[PDB]
């Protein structure tokens, strides 16, 4: 993966575009991706 640049990620099912940045929010150990309002997938957890 890359950081801080617009990249067309295909993320094990989730396919979007955007910059990827180190995030401060903490997940639960089973949770995979986040959203806040209306499927806006703001955060993902990279699997490998």
């Amino acid at each position: 993966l890359v950081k801080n640049k617009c990249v067309n990620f295909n993320f094990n099912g989730l396919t979007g575009t955007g910059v990827l940045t180190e995030s401060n929010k903490k997940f639960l150990p089973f949770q995979q991706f986040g959203r806040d309002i209306a499927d806006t997938t703001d955060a993902v957890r990279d699997p490998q």
Binding site: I37, A38, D39, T40
Partner: protein, 48 residues
């Protein structure tokens, strides 16, 4: 004149107290903001 000046200052202070303590006197602005934000929120909700 002094009585009228005293009534003026007392009424202005009563407005400060009334709007500071009692809420939902600003309903006409808050509902405008809430209705616009609700419309934009359901517009993004329609993508799912």
């Amino acid at each position: 004149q002094k009585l009228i000046a005293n009534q003026f200052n007392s009424a202005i202070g009563k407005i400060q107290d009334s709007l500071s303590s009692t809420p939902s006197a600003l309903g006409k602005l808050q509902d405008v903001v809430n209705q616009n934000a609700q419309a934009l929120n359901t517009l993004v909700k329609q993508l799912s």
